[PDB]
From a paper:
The gene [name] (also referred to as [name]) was previously identified as a regulator of biofilm dispersal. [name] expression decreases extracellular polysaccharide (EPS) production, cell length and aggregation while simultaneously increasing extracellular DNA production and motility. Using two complementary binding assays, we show that [name] binds specifically to NADPH, and thus is highly likely its endogenous cofactor.
Here, we describe the crystal structure of [name] at 2.05 Å, where we show that [name] is a member of the short-chain dehydrogenase/reductase family. The SDR active site consists of a conserved catalytic triad (Ser-Tyr-Lys), which is C-terminal to the cofactor binding motif, Gly-X3-Gly-X-Gly. These residue(s) are responsible for binding the 2′-phosphate. Furthermore, using isothermal titration calorimetry (ITC) and thermal stabilization assays, we identified the biologically relevant cofactor of [name] to be NADPH. Previously, [name] was hypothesized to suppress biofilm formation by binding and quenching the secondary messenger c-di-GMP. However, we were unable to show binding of c-di-GMP to [name] using both DSF and ITC, excluding the possibility of a direct interaction. Furthermore, [name] does not contain any of the well-known c-di-GMP binding motifs present in other proteins (GGDEF, EAL, HD-GYP). Thus, our data suggests that [name] most likely influences biofilm dispersal by regulating a process that affects a c-di-GMP related pathway.
Author numbering:
A (entry chain A): 2 to 85, 95 to 133, 143 to 178, 204 to 231
B (entry chain B): 0 to 84, 91 to 134, 142 to 176, 207 to 231
Amino acid sequence: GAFTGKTVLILGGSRGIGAAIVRRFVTDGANVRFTYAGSKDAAKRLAQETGATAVFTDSADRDAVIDVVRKSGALDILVVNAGINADDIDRLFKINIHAPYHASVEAARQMPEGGRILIIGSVMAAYAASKSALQGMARGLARDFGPRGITINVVQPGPGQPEEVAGMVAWLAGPEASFVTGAMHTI
Amino acid sequence: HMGAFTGKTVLILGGSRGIGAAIVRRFVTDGANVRFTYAGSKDAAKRLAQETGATAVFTDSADRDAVIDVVRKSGALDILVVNAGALELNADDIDRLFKINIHAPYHASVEAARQMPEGGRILIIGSVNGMAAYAASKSALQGMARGLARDFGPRGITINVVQPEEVAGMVAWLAGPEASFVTGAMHTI
């Protein structure tokens, strides 16, 4: 496969876009581990189908996110899938902004040069702030970890779709996108 | 004396130091009833309050509930000013940064909009210039201003971001009569 021998970690990979990304990297011969929270049964079936390793992790819980990344050693590719009241808004910010930041920083300091960090945006006005934040974060991270030979890209899906997003993710993780970083890609 | 904002109530989140203090002075000069929140020195906040004749109240901008509460306690305010803003940062301080620069401006603006009359003015002050956390926060504010303007538009409430006395002047102008149609934009000084 195109990613044979590569170590991949996918946060929030049990369902939808996340699951498609898991399937894509496994099909391309990569060693894949992914995380899940509420959907245990979905993660179980995905692990059974692909052979990928599933680990429970609360994406809203910051320390859990940092821990699961840290325990993954020198990963080659990190994928952070955001997924889908004042508490609802704060939850949205933690998944769209906080979790991708902490995971990316933790991963980047463990990655070899050529490492790829990929963030999948979530699918009122907190959304506009979240999307904008990810675009800004992509630019900032690229500046920060560019000298390390690490690329950072955001894939923002529209309001099937998972397979197409996974294709974009795979391309961005590949050799043809080595000079593409600090970007948000709308698909 | 009376001025441009006589009879108007202004709430300034984080107006104890720097740009915040300048904005406090400017609105008092323009005759407004000014209240501001402080996070650090009680002595400095009390000093500024007595010097300017403004109200000072403690509030940690990182605390969502405290931010929402202090806005609610302000009643039917006319102008809201949210003043946002090391070798290595720990995870908690990063989350604090995001809460101060992203969470607080959102919740404060949303809560203030529920209390404002037509013509109400919301003004967010950006951080003074690892870059990633800063870049994300600045971009977030720009996207937030546009998104909230659509929600606040039919209410007659405008919202703008001022990204850094020059700031205080731009703040007072955006809060003035001429900028009644100006909303949802980020303005660099």
